[PDB]
């Protein structure tokens, strides 16, 4: 059984392209991950923004109703905290937002691998294809010489009738 000659490349570029499938998928998971606690951190976030809000609105409502110099200066100074604690979630928003980018770009670079992968397993499957052509027609080719052969040989004999 005259096999191609270069199965065990081609088994192993298939094996790659299944290495390949298997860490873009991976990728897609991490990426979610990341994605996932950029969520979080936007809700942590978010709970920050909207105390702020309700802190400046009640001032704002104190404000409209009249209010003394002194109820202006405390609700003041404790919106000057709440505010400070709203830039820090903001960073660390931020933060989580390169660790998205970061893994997007890991995914990116995993289809591309992939890509190639596939590219180079097609251009083994291609030359297995014409290996094989190439061997059924020398296969023939052999074969045709060899009834030639024989057919001479025969009638040779039946020359040598007499």
Same mark, same amino acid.
């Given at each position: 059984?005259?096999?191609?000659?270069?199965?065990?490349?081609?088994?192993?570029?298939?094996?790659?392209?299944?290495?390949? !499938?298997?860490?873009?998928? !991976? &990728?897609? %998971?991490?990426?979610?991950?990341? +994605?996932?606690?950029? %969520?979080?951190?936007?809700?942590?976030?978010?709970?920050?923004? @909207?105390?702020?809000?309700?802190?400046?609105?009640?001032?704002? !409502? +104190?404000?409209?109703?009249?209010? *003394?110099?002194?109820?202006?200066? $405390?609700? $003041?100074?404790?919106?000057?905290?709440?505010?400070?604690?709203?830039?820090?979630?903001?960073? $660390?928003?931020?933060? +989580?937002?390169? @660790?998205?980018?970061?893994?997007? $770009?890991?995914?990116?670079?995993?289809?591309?691998?992939? *890509? &190639?992968? %596939?590219?180079?397993?097609?251009? *083994?499957?291609?030359?297995?294809?014409?290996?094989? &052509?190439?061997?059924? &027609? !020398?296969?023939?080719?052999?074969?045709?010489?060899?009834?030639?052969?024989?057919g001479q040989?025969l009638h040779q004999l039946h020359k040598?009738?007499?």
């Amino acid at each position: 059984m005259v096999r191609y000659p270069l199965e065990p490349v081609l088994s192993i570029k298939k094996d790659r392209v299944d290495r390949a !499938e298997k860490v873009v998928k !991976e &990728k897609r %998971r991490l990426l979610e991950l990341e +994605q996932e606690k950029l %969520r979080e951190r936007e809700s942590e976030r978010d709970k920050v923004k @909207n105390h702020y809000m309700q802190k400046i609105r009640q001032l704002r !409502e +104190q404000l409209d109703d009249g209010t *003394t110099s002194d109820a202006i200066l $405390k609700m $003041k100074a404790y919106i000057k905290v709440v505010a400070i604690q709203l830039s820090e979630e903001e960073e $660390k928003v931020n933060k +989580q937002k390169e @660790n998205v980018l970061a893994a997007s $770009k890991e995914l990116e670079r995993a289809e591309v691998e992939l *890509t &190639k992968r %596939r590219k180079e397993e097609e251009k *083994t499957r291609l030359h297995k294809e014409e290996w094989m &052509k190439e061997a059924l &027609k !020398e296969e023939a080719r052999q074969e045709e010489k060899e009834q030639d052969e024989m057919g001479q040989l025969l009638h040779q004999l039946h020359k040598q009738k007499q």
